[PDB]
Amino acid sequence: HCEEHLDPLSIYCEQDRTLVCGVCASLGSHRGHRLLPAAEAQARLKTQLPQQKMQLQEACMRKEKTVAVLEHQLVEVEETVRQFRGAVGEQLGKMRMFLAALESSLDREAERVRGDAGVALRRELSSLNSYLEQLRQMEKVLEEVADKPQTEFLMKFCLVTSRLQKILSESPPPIQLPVISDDFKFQVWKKMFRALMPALEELTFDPSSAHPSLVVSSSGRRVECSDQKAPPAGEDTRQFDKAVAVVAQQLLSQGEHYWEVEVGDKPRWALGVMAADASRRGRLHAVPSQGLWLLGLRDGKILEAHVEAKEPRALRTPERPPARIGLYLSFADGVLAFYDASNPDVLTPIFSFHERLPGPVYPIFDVCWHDKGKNAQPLLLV
Amino acid sequence: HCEEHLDPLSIYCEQDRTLVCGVCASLGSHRGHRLLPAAEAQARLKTQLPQQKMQLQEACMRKEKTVAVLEHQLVEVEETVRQFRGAVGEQLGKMRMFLAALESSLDREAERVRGDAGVALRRELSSLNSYLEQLRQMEKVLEEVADKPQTEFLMKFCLVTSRLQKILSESPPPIQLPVISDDFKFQVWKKMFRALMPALEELTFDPSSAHPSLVVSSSGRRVECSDQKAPPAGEDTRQFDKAVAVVAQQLLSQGEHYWEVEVGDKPRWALGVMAADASRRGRLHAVPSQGLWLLGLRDGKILEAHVEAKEPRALRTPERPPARIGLYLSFADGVLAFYDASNPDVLTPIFSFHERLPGPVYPIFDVCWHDKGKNAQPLLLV
Ligand SMILES: [Zn+2]
Ligand SMILES: [Zn+2]
Ligand SMILES: [Zn+2]
Ligand SMILES: [Zn+2]
């Protein structure tokens, strides 16, 4: 069955992977090569089948896992796509809607003022029309009196003479016009930069860490400072001895939150933002690298900002002392907002940390000591 | 006909303003009073009518003119109402639509990105599906290989094994995922302060007052400096002798307008406001009382704004040399806007005078002399 040597090729030449016969395995192209039988050949096929099966199935598992991961990250990618589509719509919604609603409100206010003015002026026109009607009727009666029967025409003059003089003595009585201008666009856009702020939030205090220097009352809504007496401190798990302070109960140190408060002008102090990575005792110069950022104020006009560095920083004096501060917190890009809005309709920023040190802070604040009662400004909500 | 003296009442008692008769004027209530003949009384009526006619008609004129003036201011009130509603709509449209156009552009960008990601991963998954189909088809030879004649089943293994190994080995390696974040506040405010721009303006030069030292070309939009020579040419109203400068022909001192310009790197210069109602001769002795305010910079970094007074005012020293400036003009309150936009999507303000000086200005600006060729930088528009 060799077709040239007539032996059924029944020997494997593992040196040459060749099916061979007597002469084919003895000489020719396989003069000194290896010879294997066909029963051992089938046996070795049966022996090497399982590992090749396992290789096939493991490659299939690899590619199946790859496809599954590709489609899973596809659904996650489109989940992010749709979610940010909806979030973008949300942002537009808030801002655009607020602006449009306020504009419609101003439109109805102007319409109401115009309607009131129109009603008043229509009443005035009705009064003057009644005056004119009286004039016309009395003058036609005057024409009659002039050209009516002789004797009584000679008589009747004095009534109308006196009435004319008296109604001339009846003197008719002898304004609020706020029209727009071109600066309104610009100042309204300034007010929109103010209006970037969102709505109110959940507001409750927590007087737990109150060192006996300040005072909190009104169901934990009103907080101010005074000097009742001078008792030493008292400590709890996270309280302090010399660094008087007070916290708020809400603690959601991720995502974004916001609200506004007022402080005003206070004689002298230093305060800032606090994280657990540093010391908490005394009025020492704390290193903001360990989560204690400082900023001191005197004269309601002079601010020195203890830098993320060695010594304090100077701040250029503003054109007006500050009045009110709004706070906004988020942690995706070190989002920290603490800005002054002297009136709640205007806004210019102050500063921010452009470096990204997360340093999870704790909501807790305090102002420096009274020093004979010069440091008593309050705070509330809403 | 007296009913008490039986005399037809024919005497007026002007002493008692009483129409009486003969006996009534002789005795009774007018025993020694004044007497009028009553024929002359009818004559007095006919004679004295016209002046009282004029008085009553003047009262009617007062009423009519008062009503006319009130109604004229009424029509002006409703004209203002409708017109400022329309103007409010004009602003609303401009700003809101502009911003919406940008967000829609971002929407198309997001849709295209989603499509591109889908296309790439669809191509890869289709290739992998073809791979898996090939794997299954090649594995299907299982039945024949297991139960077919001995010899060829012993033989045919090698090249199919090698092809399987190659197609398993050729795995292509691959995240570019720009989803929104919380820095949206800062970057979106940058781009919204960019989108604040109203439309462009008509900008063309006028080389009539060009002192022959520098050169302007590119259809009167590009301007630069060189020194062929410096001869003082024939001079006109707004030409110069040593303080080289050149003006523009356009003068539209009404409405509101805006445009963009570039500055680049220049050694030292000065700028402010100049009007044609004052001098233009020599080294520009500018009178800030007449709307010619000066403000000087040197070293490319230091600017001081000279008021018409003893101490000029300081500007906090900036962090960066200027790149590009945008200008905006309006005439309701001396509205002057000059802000730095290094790239057209970023913007930083400088300052402004809140006072209202109409002061019809002349459009012209200029830099100091070449001074060793350091001041030979060109300028164009956007
Ligand atoms: Zn043979
Ligand atoms: Zn061989
Ligand atoms: Zn009588
Ligand atoms: Zn009398």
Author numbering:
A (entry chain A), B (entry chain B): 85 to 258, 263 to 470
The article reads:
To obtain a high-resolution model, numerous constructs were generated, purified and crystallized; however, most of them diffracted poorly. After introducing point mutations and deletions, we were finally able to resolve molecular models of mouse TRIM72, including RING-deleted (ΔRING, 2.75 Å; the highest resolution is in parentheses), full-length (FL, 4.6 Å) and wild-type (WT, 7.1 Å) TRIM72. TRIM72 is a tight dimer, as determined by size exclusion chromatography (SEC) coupled with multiangle light scattering (SEC–MALS), and its overall shape was determined to be elongated in solution by SEC coupled with small-angle X-ray scattering (SEC–SAXS). The overall structure of the TRIM72 dimer has an elongated shape. The coiled-coil domains (CCDs) form the main scaffold of an antiparallel dimer with a length of approximately 17 nm.
Tripartite motif-containing protein (TRIM)72 (mitsugumin 53; MG53) has been determined to rapidly nucleate vesicles at the site of membrane damage, but the underlying molecular mechanisms remain poorly understood. Here we present the structure of Mus musculus TRIM72, a complete model of a TRIM E3 ubiquitin ligase. Its domain organization includes an RBCC domain followed by a PRY motif associated with a SPRY domain identified in splA kinase and ryanodine receptors (PRYSPRY) domain.
